[PDB]
């Protein structure tokens, strides 16, 4: 679990992200695919965006990216007790999309990299440590949840 000081670090940067969420989302999905091309294959709807350019141009990618971060910010806002918001995510990711935990850690690292790039003066060492720990808590709990649905991860 994180301490409240850590949580203050996390939610402080998150407040800086929200006014530009969509552009943050978009860049996370694109960087995901670029740096770990095998993840693209889990997405039937984006199967055909083979070039980088096309990805940059897709309205669907941007809206999917926004959806992703929107879910993530509700979970981070519940701090250590985020059961209820996490459950339905773990359910869809375990039974419908089937995404391994290794792919979850890949996106996590890319979220931290994107924010760091976009907030060079407010995302310092304490904050990146705290955000890394919040996302690690989210991956861990997703991984526990997954077992309740019959999925290994
Ligand atoms: C780690 C942060 C993640 C979050 C917060 C996130 C969140 C979401 C949300 C809110 C949705 C749509 C509603 C739902 O189906 O539950 C979703 C869709 C999906 N997620 Fe994720 N996701 C995460 C990571 C991943 C990863 C790493 C992958 C694949 C490598 C992935 C693949 C998908 C798929 C395939 C869909 C369906 C998209 C469609 O409608 O066609 N998710 N995700
Ligand atoms: C969501 N990927």
């Amino acid at each position: 679990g994180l301490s409240d000081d850590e949580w203050n670090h996390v939610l402080g940067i998150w407040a800086k992200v929200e006014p530009d969420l969509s552009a943050h989302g978009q860049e996370v999905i694109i960087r995901l695919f670029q740096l770990h091309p095998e993840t693209q294959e889990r997405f039937a709807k984006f199967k055909n965006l083979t070039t980088i350019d096309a990805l940059k141009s897709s309205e669907e990618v941007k809206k999917h990216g926004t959806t992703v971060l929107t879910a993530l910010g509700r979970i981070l806002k519940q701090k250590n007790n985020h059961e209820q918001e996490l459950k339905p995510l773990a359910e869809s990711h375990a039974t419908k999309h089937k995404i391994p935990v290794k792919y979850l850690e890949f996106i996590c690292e890319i979220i931290v990299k994107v924010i760091a790039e976009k907030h060079p003066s407010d995302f310092g060492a304490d904050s990146q440590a705290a955000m890394k720990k919040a996302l690690e808590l989210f991956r861990n709990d997703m991984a526990s949840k997954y077992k309740e649905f019959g999925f290994q991860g």
Side-chain angles (χ1 to χ4, degrees), residues 1-4 6-12 14-34 36-44 46 49-50 54-55 57-58 60-62 64-82 85-86 88-95 97 99-101 103-108 110-112 114-131 134-144 146 148-151 153:
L2 278 66
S3 56
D4 285 298
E6 280 174 324
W7 288 109
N8 293 315
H9 275 110
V10 173
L11 294 179
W14 199 260
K16 284 171 182 87
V17 167
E18 301 175 301
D20 211 34
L21 193 128
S22 261
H24 272 80
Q26 173 193 62
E27 194 53 50
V28 302
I29 291 303
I30 296 175
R31 282 266 288 136
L32 177 65
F33 298 164
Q34 173 178 225
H36 300 279
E38 340 73 76
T39 53
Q40 190 166 357
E41 280 40 284
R42 289 287 120 124
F43 289 84
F46 298 147
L49 299 184
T50 347
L55 273 181
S57 61
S58 180
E60 278 322 311
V61 157
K62 184 161 166 196
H64 176 82
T66 298
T67 279
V68 180
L69 301 192
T70 285
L72 184 65
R74 289 208 290 247
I75 284 152
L76 297 177
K77 294 170 167 181
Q78 288 217 258
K79 310 196 279 153
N80 291 322
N81 304 126
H82 55 215
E85 289 288 330
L86 223 182
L89 204 77
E91 192 182 297
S92 62
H93 289 63
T95 73
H97 320 304
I99 296 104
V101 173
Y103 290 2
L104 294 182
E105 78 197 38
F106 280 161
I107 200 167
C108 293
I110 279 120
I111 286 157
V112 173
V114 173
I115 295 176
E117 233 173 283
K118 298 185 137 89
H119 307 274
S121 64
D122 296 305
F123 195 54
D126 301 312
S127 302
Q128 304 192 6
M131 180 66 158
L135 293 173
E136 189 193 359
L137 172 81
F138 156 79
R139 260 181 296 162
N140 291 339
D141 293 348
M142 278 284 282
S144 299
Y146 263 15
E148 291 183 30
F149 305 109
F151 174 78

